Design a protein around this ligand. Structure first.
Ligand SMILES: *[C@@H]1O[C@H](CO)[C@@H](O[C@@H]2O[C@H](CO)[C@@H](O[C@@H]3O[C@H](CO)[C@@H](O)[C@H](O)[C@@H]3O)[C@H](O)[C@H]2NC(C)=O)[C@H](O)[C@H]1NC(C)=O
Ligand SMILES: *[C@@H]1O[C@H](CO)[C@@H](O[C@@H]2O[C@H](CO)[C@@H](O)[C@H](O)[C@H]2NC(C)=O)[C@H](O)[C@H]1NC(C)=O
Ligand SMILES: *[C@@H]1O[C@H](CO)[C@@H](O[C@@H]2O[C@H](CO)[C@@H](O)[C@H](O)[C@H]2NC(C)=O)[C@H](O)[C@H]1NC(C)=O
Ligand SMILES: *[C@@H]1O[C@H](CO)[C@@H](O[C@@H]2O[C@H](CO)[C@@H](O)[C@H](O)[C@H]2NC(C)=O)[C@H](O)[C@H]1NC(C)=O
Ligand SMILES: *[C@@H]1O[C@H](CO)[C@@H](O[C@@H]2O[C@H](CO)[C@@H](O)[C@H](O)[C@H]2NC(C)=O)[C@H](O)[C@H]1NC(C)=O
Ligand SMILES: *[C@@H]1O[C@H](CO)[C@@H](O[C@@H]2O[C@H](CO)[C@@H](O)[C@H](O)[C@H]2NC(C)=O)[C@H](O)[C@H]1NC(C)=O
Ligand SMILES: *[C@@H]1O[C@H](CO)[C@@H](O[C@@H]2O[C@H](CO)[C@@H](O)[C@H](O)[C@H]2NC(C)=O)[C@H](O)[C@H]1NC(C)=O
Ligand code: NAG
Ligand code: NAG
Ligand code: NAG
Ligand code: NAG
Ligand code: NAG
Ligand code: NAG
Ligand code: NAG
Ligand code: NAG
Ligand code: NAG
Ligand code: NAG
Ligand code: NAG
Ligand code: NAG
Ligand code: NAG
Ligand code: NAG
Ligand code: NAG
Ligand code: NAG
Ligand code: NAG
Ligand code: NAG
Lengths: 132, 103, 126, 441, 126, 53, 43, 53
């Protein structure tokens, strides 16, 4: 599935950042016995990569009713929400510090019981830079 | 859970066979995923469930499980495989990764 | 082995040698057009199989691929020689030339089975 | 020597999937009348010497239940009035008569033009809508919330949403194996298999954070999870004792019928007699504390004795998950339940949970259709048992032993796993072959 | 008496003593979801019973709970001693360890029954 | 229209005929219909002349 | 040259989410889908 | 034509997908058949059709 994210952002310490991730025409599934388009139980994961470093996991949101699980390293200043109408996911990170400069990726999770935490499709990545 | 993966870096010539290790602190079954990130490019899924190839991935990629010891084996290495490797276990990503470059 | 209807064009004896392969294939969701057609087909198949099985059961031949009876064959139905029938004829023509006398044969079968079973009961009781 | 002997009716079963019909012992949404009348005396047979593998997480019965419930919910909605003309501009004013501090702005007094029985004729009527039902348009102008991306269909007022127990009975040639082990977690072999023609009374209650009206564990509180190490799989908790919960809607609501067309009636919300208070669910403080103590005692096994267990409220999402949503006498509640999962644990009084009401309900998250729950006349009041929890463990650093657990839910399948955990579907295979010294004559 | 699947964990002989109680339970409105599920379940039960009845009928064993045949035991499917099998084993394990050889045994039974019946035909004719 | 405040009408399709056509109600296999042939049968009690169809 | 008159740029009043509120929007229809009524009026 | 699908909401949850402005030149939709291949196929058809006439 194709993923599209917002453009580069420039921020100051202590500000707030919002990066968008849109996954067109992928929020809905057709349960055949039920004969309608239902919102599937997908997970959209949010990951960031510091310059030259490894990957780090931030949190993921359940498309069904918005269930969110957050990494303890970011609890209290992180908020992930999705809009089923626009098929978009929003990452809202608060109290940005100078070490948060990273390329933030949104990833698609089919949430299949036989393949835990599979990140099948990835967005192009978003550069978020913070400085004074 | 803590996940460790080694060696930190390695250089191999064209066509060589190389393997990368990813050790998990606890029994997690086969729930290990392998990711490829080319320089300046977004990562993409490579192996899921530690032995299943992602769509579009060539058959030269192979993953195996030995208890808590996971290995991803590379056959007939090709230039496009340059980059870094990451192994995923639930919410834990191994620090640093393994950079693979041509010799 | 030839398969389902494999010996359709074979002679009488060769076809009778492999009755099982044709014998084993008479028996083997929402309210969608495909679903309802599937259900109708399933019910039709099961009813046809049980009609055939019941018809065998009346003549006291249930469970037997080849079963003999006690009604004579009136030559009016067919006077052909046995060697010609069982070595130079297929089942298709055989059903073709006895399509009309089938019902009276079935009735004779039923009556003979009933009478024979009553006689067997009489002998068993005495 | 030996010869092949065929046996009919041998007790041999294989795991299999099949359609299960309903049986149950006013018209209701689940169409329990259509269920065949169950036998007054169910037959239960103990299969000693038998050890059968069970796995509720890969059980089909939960998926089949989900499909059946959603199909029933859809079918009960078809012969009901469609509120497509309600998507009209609303003039809503603040209701500020005999309201409390907490009720300021939660209800709206909306007046709107509406189609009369005569098509050309129009009428101006007024109705009361909760703030969660109407959205501002940019007194002020409002509209029904789902009118942007959903068609409204009023639930028929005469069909009861009450959960009538239903028994899932397998057809002939199939059997249902009940795990009678009292210390059985969701997976692994269950060496107490007993077959029954079909399951006990299952109430398809729809709740998110607290499992209402469910079945109790026989001996002690059980913690069932597919992968306790996986911090994304919901943790199914089952209580060995029931926790009672008072709650009610204090407002003396009146149902006002508005005829919107030929033989089509929309039931609005008239003026409330008396003061307007906040819908709130009561839980005994001591009973809840004791139940939480038992839960944390049984939860230390999967993590260690010295670990710190802390219960925090929901982390966020839609209203159905952040709050404890459920139906009570035809009305859908959304209770905060922040005072429940608030304590931390290391080695007469009641807790008032402020609830909120919604009328536009979009259960099952179906694209294009939503339900309008008609208001219930009088003061509704229901008493239930919290028989379970839906806990979702968070992650954490390797330097901390504090495991934070928060209420989860949303996936109704997780609600129905706690009732179909002890059952499984098998296919009887009565043909067996075994060598014997007998040879056909 | 124990009931349906009462002797599931019992030994071979005890299970064989009471085949009938599992034998009887193999067979026993509008277009509503519950109605259509009930109808499909009914038809599925009917066909599941009839497949087994047909399989018994082909082997010349219809109407008999226990039926002996003329198929020798190849001893490669299982070489276990009779006393061990019929006094220290349950039907479940027996089916577990012959899950793969079932089809060839069924085919041997079918062919053996067919030849046996035709042999009878010759003697009844002569 | 008198309906307008109590019901919604759907026009009967003009091409379908309301004329009554005789129809026979036939029981499935394994069931029989017993026809009372008594010409003085008042509808309750025994019917001495019973014919099946 | 061959496309002259095959497309029609039709604009019409259409109902919106709010039933009382109307809305004006335009769309392209092929000449075989719209017939003149006797810019001009089409349906 | 590089057509654009413009969604026009005509009611609650009801969307009418219209035709937006076309990017670039507007040409005629057409089908292509090889002249030689079609001629050969017509020759075979007419050869096989002379038999019946
Ligand atoms: C869990 O089970 C309890 C007991 O069955 C449920 O409480 C019951 O709730 C229904 C409606 O929600 C009550 O029925 C109503 O009673 C009033 C007063 O008699 C009557 O005016 C209404 O017409 C309707 O019949 C019922 O009395 C009540 N049972 C009690 C209080 O013992 C409870 O709703 C269940 N929890 C759920 C569904 O979440
Ligand atoms: C975590 O979950 C996975 C998948 O649900 C489990 O993996 C299964 O393990 C069983 C062991 O009997 C295997 O038979 C299955 O084939 C595995 N399924 C897979 C890999 O998809 C794993 O056991 C779980 N581990 C823990 C510690 O809960
Ligand atoms: C839930 O509990 C609260 C208090 O814990 C109850 O509120 C009291 O209600 C009585 C009426 O029965 C009033 O006289 C008190 O003043 C209230 N106390 C307050 C507001 O602090 C409430 O009635 C209970 N709800 C139930 C049992 O449904
Ligand atoms: C829920 O409401 C019921 C009322 O139906 C409460 O039961 C009453 O509890 C009081 C104690 O304050 C007793 O004096 C009454 O005799 C009980 N009435 C019964 C059992 O019919 C119940 O306590 C409430 N639950 C909570 C947690 O407050
Ligand atoms: C869980 O509890 C926290 C704090 O107990 C709630 O955080 C409050 O959120 C409201 C927004 O509605 C703010 O106005 C408060 O300032 C917050 N308090 C804090 C941060 O201490 C949180 O909303 C609760 N979650 C839910 C779903 O109710
Ligand atoms: C659930 O309840 C908690 C506490 O009862 C609410 O959090 C409080 O919200 C008020 C609203 O302004 C704040 O003034 C308080 O500071 C918050 N914390 C506490 C400890 O009271 C929370 O908002 C409620 N959830 C809702 C209303 O959705
Ligand atoms: C229809 O299109 C196909 C592919 O677009 C054409 O096939 C190509 O034909 C050219 C010759 O003009 C070859 O050089 C290519 O190798 C062919 N490619 C493929 C994939 O077949 C085909 O010729 C076209 N036919 C007509 C009648 O226009
Ligand atoms: C078909 O006919 C030929 C010659 O008549 C015969 O040899 C052959 O056996 C027949 N086919 C079958 C299947 O019997
Ligand atoms: C709502 O407004 C109407 C007038 O449109 C008024 O008659 C009614 O009393 C009001 N109700 C409340 C609760 O404010
Ligand atoms: C009316 O209620 C709204 C809540 O939606 C609130 O924002 C507004 O301030 C209230 N108006 C007055 C005058 O209190
Ligand atoms: C009803 O329509 C009239 C007509 O102009 C308007 O003045 C009035 O405000 C409308 N009432 C509403 C929208 O509640
Ligand atoms: C409909 O309008 C509401 C108004 O707030 C908005 O939140 C929602 O996203 C809209 N839905 C769409 C545009 O599909
Ligand atoms: C569940 O029970 C089985 C069998 O007793 C046991 O092996 C397993 O560890 C238990 N827990 C889980 C999470 O499977
Ligand atoms: C709720 O619990 C009480 C005992 O506290 C019990 O009698 C009642 O049947 C329960 N209601 C249910 C399970 O619906
Ligand atoms: C609710 O109001 C009605 C008046 O319409 C009254 O008859 C009834 O007693 C009231 N109920 C309560 C619980 O006050
Ligand atoms: C619940 O029990 C714990 C046990 O440590 C205690 O600290 C806490 O105060 C209790 N809460 C009550 C009684 O409300
Ligand atoms: C949660 O507990 C803290 C102290 O542990 C208390 O201050 C706070 O009021 C509680 N939240 C509630 C009761 O909503
Ligand atoms: C279970 O096994 C014991 C010994 O292994 C045996 O005596 C007993 O009869 C068996 N149970 C049944 C119901 O036969
Ligand atoms: C419909 O109108 C008639 C008079 O035209 C009246 O008698 C009847 O009661 C009305 N029915 C209603 C309002 O339901
Ligand atoms: C019909 O005739 C029977 C004859 O026994 C009699 O008992 C019965 O009362 C009669 N019924 C009427 C309605 O006369
Ligand atoms: C408009 O298009 C129609 C095609 O139906 C054509 O007949 C007419 O001449 C056109 N008029 C102009 C001014 O292009
Ligand atoms: C059609 O007309 C609209 C104005 O009504 C205009 O915006 C649009 O560009 C036109 N499209 C054409 C000429 O293709
Ligand atoms: C829409 O209605 C207005 C009202 O007069 C009219 O002026 C306009 O031409 C209409 N638009 C059409 C018909 O496309
Ligand atoms: C059609 O237009 C889109 C932009 O809306 C463009 O991305 C695409 O390449 C165009 N297609 C062609 C065949 O030019
Ligand atoms: C088709 O081919 C035949 C023979 O090759 C030739 O005579 C004829 O002119 C051709 N016609 C066309 C249209 O190519």
């Amino acid at each position: 599935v194709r993923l599209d994210q917002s453009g580069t952002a420039v921020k100051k310490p202590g500000a707030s950042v919002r990066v968008s991730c849109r996954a067109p025409d992928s929020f809905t599934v057709y349960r055949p016995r039920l004969s309608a388009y239902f919102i599937g139980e997908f997970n959209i994961h949010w990951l960031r990569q510091a310059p030259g470093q490894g990957l780090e996991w931030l949190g993921f949101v359940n498309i069904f009713r918005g269930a969110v699980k957050y990494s303890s390293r970011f609890q209290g200043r992180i908020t992930i929400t999705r809009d089923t109408s626009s098929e978009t996911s929003y990452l809202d990170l608060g109290a940005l510090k100078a070490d948060d400069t990273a390329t933030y990726y949104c990833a698609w999770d089919k949430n299949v019981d036989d393949n835990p935490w599979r990140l099948d499709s990835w967005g192009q990545g978003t550069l978020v830079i913070v400085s004074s | 859970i803590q996940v460790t993966q080694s060696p930190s870096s390695l250089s191999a010539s064209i066509g060589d066979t190389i393997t990368v290790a990813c050790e998990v602190s606890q029994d997690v079954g086969w729930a290990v995923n392998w990711y490829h990130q080319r320089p300046g490019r977004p990562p993409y899924n490579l192996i899921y469930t530690a032995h299943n190839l992602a769509p579009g991935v060539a058959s030269r990629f192979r993953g195996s499980r030995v208890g808590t010891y996971f290995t991803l084996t590379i056959n007939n290495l090709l230039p496009e495989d340059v980059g870094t490797y990451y192994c995923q276990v639930f919410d834990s990503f191994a620090p640093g990764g393994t950079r693979v470059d041509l010799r | 082995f030839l398969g389902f209807l494999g010996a359709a064009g074979s002679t009488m004896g060769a076809a009778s040698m492999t009755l099982t392969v044709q014998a084993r294939n008479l028996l083997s969701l929402k309210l969608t057009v495909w679903g309802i057609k599937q259900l109708q087909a399933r019910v039709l198949a099961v009813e046809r199989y049980l009609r055939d099985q019941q018809l065998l059961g009346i003549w006291g031949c249930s469970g037997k691929l080849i079963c003999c009876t006690n009604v004579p064959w009136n030559s009016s139905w067919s006077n052909r020689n046995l060697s010609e029938i069982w070595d130079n004829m297929t089942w298709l023509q055989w059903d073709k030339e006895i399509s009309n006398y089938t019902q009276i044969i079935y009735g004779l079968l039923e009556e003979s089975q009933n009478q024979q079973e009553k006689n067997e009961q009489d002998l068993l009781a005495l | 020597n030996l010869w092949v002997t065929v046996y009919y009716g041998v007790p041999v079963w294989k795991d299999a999937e099949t359609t299960l019909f309903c049986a149950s012992d006013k018209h209701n949404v689940w169409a329990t009348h259509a269920c065949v009348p169950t036998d007054p005396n169910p037959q239960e047979i103990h299969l000693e010497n038998v050890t059968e593998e069970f796995n509720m997480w890969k059980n089909n019965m939960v998926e089949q239940m989900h499909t059946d419930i959603i199909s029933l919910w859809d079918q009960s909605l078809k012969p009901c009035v469609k509120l497509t003309p309600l998507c009209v501009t609303l003039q809503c004013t603040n209701v500020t008569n005999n309201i409390t501090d907490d009720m300021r702005g939660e209800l709206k007094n909306c007046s709107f033009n509406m189609t009369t029985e005569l098509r050309d004729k129009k009428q101006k009527v007024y109705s009361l809508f909760y703030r969660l039902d109407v959205v501002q348009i940019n007194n002020k102008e409002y509209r029904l919330i789902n009118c942007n991306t959903s068609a409204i269909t009023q639930a028929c007022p005469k069909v009861s949403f009450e959960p009538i127990p239903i028994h899932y009975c397998a057809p002939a040639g199939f059997a249902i194996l009940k795990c009678k082990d009292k210390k059985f977690n969701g997976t692994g072999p269950c060496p107490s298999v007993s077959t029954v023609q079909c399951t006990h009374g299952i109430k398809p209650v729809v709740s998110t954070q607290l499992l209402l009206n469910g079945s109790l564990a026989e001996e002690e509180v059980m913690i069932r999870s597919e992968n306790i190490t996986n911090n994304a799989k919901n943790i199914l908790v089952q209580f060995n004792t029931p926790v009672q919960i008072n709650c009610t809607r204090p407002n003396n609501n009146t149902r006002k019928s508005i005829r919107i067309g030929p033989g089509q009636a929309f039931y609005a919300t008239g003026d409330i007699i008396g003061d307007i208070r906040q819908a709130h669910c009561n839980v005994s403080k001591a009973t809840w504390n004791e139940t939480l103590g038992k839960v944390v005692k049984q939860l230390r096994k999967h993590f260690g004795n010295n670990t710190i267990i802390r219960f925090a409220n929901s982390s966020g999402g839609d209203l159905e998950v952040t709050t404890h949503s459920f139906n009570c006498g035809g009305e859908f509640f959304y209770c905060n339940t922040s005072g429940l999962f608030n304590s931390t644990w290391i080695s007469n009084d009641s807790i008032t949970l402020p609830c909120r009401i919604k009328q536009i309900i979009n259960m099952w998250q179906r694209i294009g259709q939503a339900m309008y729950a008609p208001p219930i006349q009088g003061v509704i009041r229901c008493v239930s048992n919290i028989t379970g929890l839906i806990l979702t463990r968070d992650g954490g650093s390797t330097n901390s032993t504090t495991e934070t657990f928060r209420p989860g839910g949303g996936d109704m399948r997780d609600n129905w796993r706690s009732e179909l955990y002890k059952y499984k579907v098998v296919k009887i295979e009565p043909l067996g072959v075994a060598p014997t010294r007998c040879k056909r004559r």
